Design a protein around this nucleic acid. Structure first.
Ligand SMILES: [Mg+2]
Ligand SMILES: [Mg+2]
Ligand SMILES: [Mg+2]
Ligand SMILES: [Mg+2]
Ligand SMILES: [Mg+2]
Ligand SMILES: [Mg+2]
Ligand SMILES: [Mg+2]
Ligand SMILES: [Mg+2]
Ligand SMILES: [Mg+2]
Ligand SMILES: [Mg+2]
Ligand SMILES: [Mg+2]
Ligand SMILES: [Mg+2]
Ligand SMILES: [Mg+2]
Ligand SMILES: [Mg+2]
Ligand SMILES: [Mg+2]
Ligand SMILES: [Mg+2]
Ligand SMILES: [Mg+2]
Ligand SMILES: [Mg+2]
Ligand SMILES: [Mg+2]
Ligand SMILES: [Mg+2]
Ligand SMILES: [Mg+2]
Ligand SMILES: [Mg+2]
Ligand SMILES: [Mg+2]
Ligand SMILES: [Mg+2]
Ligand SMILES: [Mg+2]
Ligand SMILES: [Mg+2]
Ligand SMILES: [Mg+2]
Ligand SMILES: [Mg+2]
Ligand SMILES: [Mg+2]
Ligand SMILES: [Mg+2]
Ligand SMILES: [Mg+2]
Ligand SMILES: [Mg+2]
Ligand SMILES: [Mg+2]
Ligand SMILES: [Mg+2]
Ligand SMILES: [Mg+2]
Ligand SMILES: [Mg+2]
Ligand SMILES: [Mg+2]
Ligand SMILES: [Mg+2]
Ligand SMILES: [Mg+2]
Ligand SMILES: [Mg+2]
Ligand SMILES: [Mg+2]
Ligand SMILES: [Mg+2]
Ligand SMILES: [Mg+2]
Ligand SMILES: [Mg+2]
Ligand SMILES: [Mg+2]
Ligand SMILES: [Mg+2]
Ligand SMILES: [Mg+2]
Ligand SMILES: [Mg+2]
Ligand SMILES: [Mg+2]
Ligand SMILES: [Mg+2]
Ligand SMILES: [Mg+2]
Ligand SMILES: [Mg+2]
Ligand SMILES: [Mg+2]
Ligand SMILES: [Mg+2]
Ligand SMILES: [Mg+2]
Ligand SMILES: [Mg+2]
Ligand SMILES: [Mg+2]
Ligand SMILES: [Mg+2]
Ligand SMILES: [Mg+2]
Ligand SMILES: [Mg+2]
Ligand SMILES: [Mg+2]
Ligand SMILES: [Mg+2]
Ligand SMILES: [Mg+2]
Ligand SMILES: [Mg+2]
Ligand SMILES: [Mg+2]
Ligand SMILES: [Mg+2]
Ligand SMILES: [Mg+2]
Ligand SMILES: [Mg+2]
Ligand SMILES: [Mg+2]
Ligand SMILES: [Mg+2]
Ligand SMILES: [Mg+2]
Ligand SMILES: [Mg+2]
Ligand SMILES: [Mg+2]
Ligand SMILES: [Mg+2]
Ligand SMILES: [Mg+2]
Ligand SMILES: [Mg+2]
Ligand SMILES: [Mg+2]
Ligand SMILES: [Mg+2]
Ligand SMILES: [Mg+2]
Ligand SMILES: [Mg+2]
Ligand SMILES: [Mg+2]
Ligand SMILES: [Mg+2]
Ligand SMILES: [Mg+2]
Ligand SMILES: [Mg+2]
Ligand SMILES: [Mg+2]
Ligand SMILES: [Mg+2]
Ligand SMILES: [Mg+2]
Ligand SMILES: [Mg+2]
Ligand SMILES: [Mg+2]
Ligand SMILES: [Mg+2]
Ligand SMILES: [Mg+2]
Ligand SMILES: [Mg+2]
Ligand SMILES: [Mg+2]
Ligand SMILES: [Mg+2]
Ligand SMILES: [Mg+2]
Ligand SMILES: [Mg+2]
Ligand SMILES: [Mg+2]
Ligand SMILES: [Mg+2]
Ligand SMILES: [Mg+2]
Ligand SMILES: [Mg+2]
Ligand SMILES: [Zn+2]
Lengths: 50, 77, 63, 252, 91, 112
RNA sequence: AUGGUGAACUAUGCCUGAAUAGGGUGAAGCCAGAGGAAACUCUGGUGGAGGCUCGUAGCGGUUCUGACGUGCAAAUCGAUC
RNA sequence: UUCAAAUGAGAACUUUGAAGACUGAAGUGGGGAAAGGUUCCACGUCAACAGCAGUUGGACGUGGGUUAGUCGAUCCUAAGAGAUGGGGAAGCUCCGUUUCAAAGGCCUGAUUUUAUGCAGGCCACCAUCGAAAGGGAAUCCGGUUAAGAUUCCGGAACCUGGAUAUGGAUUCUUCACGGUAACGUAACUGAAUGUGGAGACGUCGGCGCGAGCCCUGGGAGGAGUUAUCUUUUCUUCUUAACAGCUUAUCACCCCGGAAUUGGUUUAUCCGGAGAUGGGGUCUUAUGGCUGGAAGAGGCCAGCACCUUUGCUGGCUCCGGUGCGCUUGUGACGGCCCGUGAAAAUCCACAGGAAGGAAUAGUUUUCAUGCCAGGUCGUACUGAUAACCGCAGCAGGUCUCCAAGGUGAACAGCCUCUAGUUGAUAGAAUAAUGUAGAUAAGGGAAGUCGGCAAAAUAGAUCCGUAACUUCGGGAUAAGGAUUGGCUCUAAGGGUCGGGUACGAUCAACUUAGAACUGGUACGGACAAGGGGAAUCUGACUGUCUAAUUAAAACAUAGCAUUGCGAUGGUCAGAAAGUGAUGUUGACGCAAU
């Protein structure tokens, strides 16, 4: 770390973006079933394994 | 980066095509041990060197300043 | 203040001393000091003609 | 049980030689036209330490007979040879220390080093610090020449085997007690991973023919047969006698 | 002021290894370190430089020699033998 | 009192990571990294530094005028004068002694 | 049994780097001096040797069979070493 | 740990102020390597989470933030990895790496159908991957952000590639002069081929020098103390890369010709193979002066006004000290059966193919001038909460910088700078505990056993047995002494002397003598118990991570065995396979 391949930078980038809460307007959709974001990740409870 | 002393050689720089800007600086200093005197530095920005010419003589200073090319962009102080 | 009373020689008796005499000041430093002095007094006394080269070259090795 | 130590050596894992610092291979000149019809002059340019070797090497440079340039060879230095010396290699060359000559052209009693087993193998016999070989005969028909190797064995080779007059330098190296473990240590550190040596008798049976027992002991003759098989041959392999050697050796 | 009755340089090893090995070492040490005569420029300035390498302070020649002494008994006798056998070839 | 940090990511004391402390116009201490020292070119024959020649890290010699890279004499910035003196004598004498060898053996041949 | 995955721990070798307060001892070499008929023997200095020694950091892990023993901890903590 | 304020529905726990402490530069400081990956920063914010709390957070919501020709990568090669003509193998694939291979490409010439065929001459180097600590082209200061900075802004440089003209240099003696020489210089053509050097190299020791830090006088500011005392205590006073001149131990040259041997290092090395002496040449580490550059930065004072915030002044000066400390470097010296990488890349030289002037040629290794410099990383943490240990775990995890006193000291103990003041809290102080201490008289009677604990300890001086491999044993054992204050004496530098001394400056060391005290004084800290034997391993070293550290293993030493290569020992299913082997009996292998 602290001097990364672009490969790794990329992945970390993608990761940041998946780290939002459920966009609440999905909740309103007909037949919506997704309550919250069940795949949320947090830097000190689960490590990325790269 | 460069110092200069031939008051002739200097003048020749000041008309050296790429010499657009130049600058004259003034310093209070002291003479020998007793009193002070007005020192002036003649800086010319060549394309890769800043030549400066220290005229320690207030007299030769003034006469040198009207020697300056009328087309040069002299910065005063 | 203290540091003054040192170059006045105070606070320096046997009870104020924990490094061995040699730690406090090496023997060899003493020597090099002393030898270098004799060595060069000889040179001036030679340069000056006060002493002649034959006497100087014995005093040297004798130093 | 386990694969014993002397069987793991063959795969050369941790067991290869420690090579990084060695000067290069020590070899005589390629037996070309100059050396087998006349002689050719060189200059030892340097005599120098080879890591993990007893005896110093001698960098000796020659002229290329075929191109304008200097081709440098690495010799094992004979005692006496020196920086600046001129070295002569060839059939028709002269008999002084340092030169290299086919065993044919040296009278018996001549004493030479780095000798070839066949002509041109660029040097094979007596290279170790101290060692040499003495010519003891000639048989001009089928030009063979007989010599006594360092071991004691006598052998015969082509009279076109090249040798170099003199003994190998740095002799006597083995008279100085190593004194401590660390010197053997630094010794083998530039050779190979063969030191220290656990005795097989201090091992467990999986480890060795010698392992185990409530006291330490070989428990069977330690003279193993030639016909024995890997994993069996530790001890006195094919020993034709055994015990303290009494009275002068020296082959007859 | 005679500093040691017998160990000399071998004094460094203290009590270790046992007199005899120490005596054997002392001998070869004294040879190996000692300053030698240079056959070439005639000054005593040949000191050792890793076993069998003997090279001259002033004048800068290097000679392959014995592991702890310049010339080795063997070397020399061989040098004499080679003398003699060579002579046979011109006369 | 004032201490100092490295100025590059490498945190170790390698030969290529020497540091020198320095006083800036800001009135504080700052590290400055320092190139390894250049060694002196050596004489190809005898071995000394050869005098007359500048000392630069090897690629810096292409940023310097050719007079910094030689002395005038034959084998200028390559061999050490005394060494050239020597090889000249040797060259002359050997070539002379060479002629001696030839007329002497020409004599042998017609007087034998 | 068959086919696979491990040397991020650790063991060993190789390559390339880095790290180690302050003390005690005083080996070769060297200088000057003294005795003695002689052979030779003595003294004072200099010098700075060692898998040397006191002891931090380091590396280790001896005893308390100390703490803890549903722990800080699936091996740790303290003192002493 | 404490008081108060502010905030807030709510405050032991947030923010601010005050106070009391701590880490004590071997840091609880300032940064990095691996690893994490947004934790960084702002704003909002408390449902869960931070084993009390919570208005706070590395949590939660929403956003913002990581700027390079010069820093790294990228290139190089190391151990090693691994395609290829091949050889094995039913085959997945195994072996081979320059190997039993028809292995490939540069300089220009020949073109003036034309774009590039042939003409020479070479060179036979045979992939490639493998270092963010090895090798390596080149940047610095100041300023700036909520969060980036050797990356932005400012100024001032440098390297590499490409183009190029002007000036200077050089030539009618074509390819410069000068110097006796070491060699000098702004230049001062040079193909193939060859050679040389740099890259490029152990470790310890003392000695010499540099830099930064430390200590210190004077002066010009600002701050603190002032019942009393102190011309006082504290602090500011700085100068980057880069460039011109100058500067060095070593080394070398010229003159000279040496015993009465001289010169000379702390360390005994040097001289007829030319010393001592006198005169010069060189490297430019390093430093000095100037340019950069005072216009910056630092410290003050005097006005201005809600504001952005200005504005005007000054001063930023001269010195001293050294067994100091850290680091750098030099010439030396000890050591070795240890002698302590490679390659890219750069330059030089030997060579002389060639091309070149007087009506005008040659020259870009001299100066100046023009253009350009891609891609990816750059935030932060680096740990008693940003990494690994199920976790904000007393564990583990590579490194640089390093102030004052006491002291031998990077020890311990106290401090400055910086950083903390985190660890649920309140009230009591029963038993039994854990950790820290003391105890009359006796003194191991306790106990398997002196386990634990106590005793000893620094230094200076005196004194020191058996025995021994003569090196030790040895701090053997055994003794005395030690504060404070006031004196004394000894130990150095620098200068002029025609071809005996004087004058000044700057340092703690060592010994001696008075006086002095509730006989105390290494006053805390720090800091060996000693002796006589028996058993056993020679020693230093090694191991059972996590019940065994030992007498076990190792080791030097000793002895035996096998082997001359068509070989010994060992590897492999096999092979044009492999280890020892870059080897050769002073060797490898096996006990
Ligand atoms: Mg001494
Ligand atoms: Mg000194
Ligand atoms: Mg002196
Ligand atoms: Mg003398
Ligand atoms: Mg098996
Ligand atoms: Mg190998
Ligand atoms: Mg081993
Ligand atoms: Mg054994
Ligand atoms: Mg063994
Ligand atoms: Mg066992
Ligand atoms: Mg068995
Ligand atoms: Mg059996
Ligand atoms: Mg058994
Ligand atoms: Mg037995
Ligand atoms: Mg200060
Ligand atoms: Mg950094
Ligand atoms: Mg030159
Ligand atoms: Mg020069
Ligand atoms: Mg020429
Ligand atoms: Mg590992
Ligand atoms: Mg030390
Ligand atoms: Mg001590
Ligand atoms: Mg020590
Ligand atoms: Mg007498
Ligand atoms: Mg020592
Ligand atoms: Mg030790
Ligand atoms: Mg010890
Ligand atoms: Mg101590
Ligand atoms: Mg520890
Ligand atoms: Mg250990
Ligand atoms: Mg413990
Ligand atoms: Mg216990
Ligand atoms: Mg319990
Ligand atoms: Mg300890
Ligand atoms: Mg609290
Ligand atoms: Mg404190
Ligand atoms: Mg400390
Ligand atoms: Mg903390
Ligand atoms: Mg950081
Ligand atoms: Mg992380
Ligand atoms: Mg934050
Ligand atoms: Mg809540
Ligand atoms: Mg949490
Ligand atoms: Mg909670
Ligand atoms: Mg709560
Ligand atoms: Mg967030
Ligand atoms: Mg965000
Ligand atoms: Mg770079
Ligand atoms: Mg690239
Ligand atoms: Mg392969
Ligand atoms: Mg690569
Ligand atoms: Mg690299
Ligand atoms: Mg590197
Ligand atoms: Mg910004
Ligand atoms: Mg920052
Ligand atoms: Mg900045
Ligand atoms: Mg800029
Ligand atoms: Mg600019
Ligand atoms: Mg260019
Ligand atoms: Mg000229
Ligand atoms: Mg080359
Ligand atoms: Mg080289
Ligand atoms: Mg290297
Ligand atoms: Mg620079
Ligand atoms: Mg001189
Ligand atoms: Mg002269
Ligand atoms: Mg250091
Ligand atoms: Mg060496
Ligand atoms: Mg060069
Ligand atoms: Mg031609
Ligand atoms: Mg140019
Ligand atoms: Mg490109
Ligand atoms: Mg950063
Ligand atoms: Mg933290
Ligand atoms: Mg974790
Ligand atoms: Mg996990
Ligand atoms: Mg932890
Ligand atoms: Mg902190
Ligand atoms: Mg707790
Ligand atoms: Mg009692
Ligand atoms: Mg008693
Ligand atoms: Mg009893
Ligand atoms: Mg009793
Ligand atoms: Mg009882
Ligand atoms: Mg018992
Ligand atoms: Mg009993
Ligand atoms: Mg005890
Ligand atoms: Mg008591
Ligand atoms: Mg005994
Ligand atoms: Mg005793
Ligand atoms: Mg007293
Ligand atoms: Mg005095
Ligand atoms: Mg033992
Ligand atoms: Mg031990
Ligand atoms: Mg165990
Ligand atoms: Mg087990
Ligand atoms: Mg033990
Ligand atoms: Mg244990
Ligand atoms: Mg024995
Ligand atoms: Mg085959
Ligand atoms: Zn010589």
């Amino acid at each position: 770390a602290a001097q990364k391949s672009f490969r790794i930078k990329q992945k970390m980038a993608k990761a940041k973006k998946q780290n939002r809460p459920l966009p609440q307007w999905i909740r309103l959709r007909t037949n919506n079933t997704i309550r919250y974001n069940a795949k949320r990740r947090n830097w000190r409870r689960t490590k990325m394994n790269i | 980066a460069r110092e200069i002393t031939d008051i002739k050689q200097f003048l020749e720089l000041t008309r050296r095509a790429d010499v657009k800007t130049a600058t004259v600086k003034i310093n209070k200093k002291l003479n020998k041990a007793g009193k002070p005197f007005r020192q002036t530095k003649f800086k010319v920005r060549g394309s890769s060197s800043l030549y400066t010419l220290v005229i320690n003589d207030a007299g030769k200073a003034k006469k040198l300043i009207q020697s300056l090319p009328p087309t040069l962009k002299v910065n005063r102080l | 203040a203290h540091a003054q009373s040192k170059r006045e020689g105070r606070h320096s008796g046997y009870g104020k001393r924990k490094g061995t005499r040699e730690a406090r000041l090496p023997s060899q430093v003493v020597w090099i000091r002393r030898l270098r002095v004799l060595r060069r007094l000889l040179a001036k006394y030679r340069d000056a003609g006060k002493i002649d080269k034959h006497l100087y070259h014995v005093l040297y090795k004798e130093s | 049980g386990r694969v014993i130590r002397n069987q793991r050596k063959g795969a050369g894992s941790i067991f290869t030689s420690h090579t990084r610092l060695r000067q290069g291979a020590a070899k005589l000149r390629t037996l070309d036209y100059a050396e087998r019809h006349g002689y050719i002059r060189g200059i030892v340019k340097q005599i120098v330490h080879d890591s993990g070797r007893g005896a110093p090497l001698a960098k000796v440079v020659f002229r290329d007979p075929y191109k304008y340039r200097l081709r440098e060879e690495i010799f094992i230095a004979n005692e006496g040879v020196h920086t600046g010396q001129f070295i002569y290699a060839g059939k028709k060359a002269s008999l002084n220390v340092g030169n290299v000559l086919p065993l044919g052209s040296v009278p018996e009693g001549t004493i030479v080093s780095n000798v070839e087993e066949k002509p041109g193998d660029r040097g094979a016999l007596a290279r170790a610090s101290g060692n040499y070989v003495i010519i003891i005969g000639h048989n001009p028909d089928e030009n063979k020449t007989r010599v006594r190797l360092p071991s004691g064995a006598k052998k015969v080779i082509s009279s076109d085997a090249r040798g170099v007059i003199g003994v190998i330098a740095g002799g006597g190296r083995v008279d100085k007690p190593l004194l401590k473990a660390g010197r053997a240590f630094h010794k083998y550190r530039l050779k190979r991973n063969s030191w220290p040596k656990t005795r097989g008798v201090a091992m467990n049976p999986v480890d060795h023919p010698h392992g185990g027992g409530n006291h330490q002991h070989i428990g069977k003759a330690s003279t193993i047969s030639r016909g024995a098989v890997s994993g069996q041959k530790a001890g006195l392999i094919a020993a034709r006698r055994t015990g303290l050697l009494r009275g002068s050796q020296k082959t007859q | 002021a005679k500093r040691t009755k017998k160990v000399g340089i071998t004094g460094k090893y203290g009590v270790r290894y046992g007199s005899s090995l120490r005596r054997q070492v002392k001998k070869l040490e004294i040879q190996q370190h000692a300053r030698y005569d240079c056959s070439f420029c005639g000054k005593k300035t040949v000191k050792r430089g890793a076993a069998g390498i003997w090279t001259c302070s002033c004048c800068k020649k290097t000679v392959a020699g014995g592991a702890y002494t310049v010339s080795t008994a063997a070397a020399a006798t061989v040098r004499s033998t080679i003398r003699r056998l060579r002579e046979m070839v011109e006369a | 009192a004032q201490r100092v940090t490295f100025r590059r990511r490498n945190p170790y004391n390698t030969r290529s990571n020497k540091i020198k402390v320095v006083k800036t116009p800001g009135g504080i201490l700052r590290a400055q990294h320092v190139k390894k020292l250049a060694t002196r070119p050596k004489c190809g024959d005898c071995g000394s530094a050869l005098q007359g020649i500048s000392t630069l890290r090897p690629r810096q010699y292409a940023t310097v005028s050719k007079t910094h890279k030689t002395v005038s004499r034959a084998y200028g910035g390559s061999r050490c004068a005394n060494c050239v003196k020597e090889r000249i004598i040797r060259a002359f004498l050997i070539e002379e002694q060479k002629i001696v060898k030839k007329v002497v053996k020409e004599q042998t041949e017609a007087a034998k």
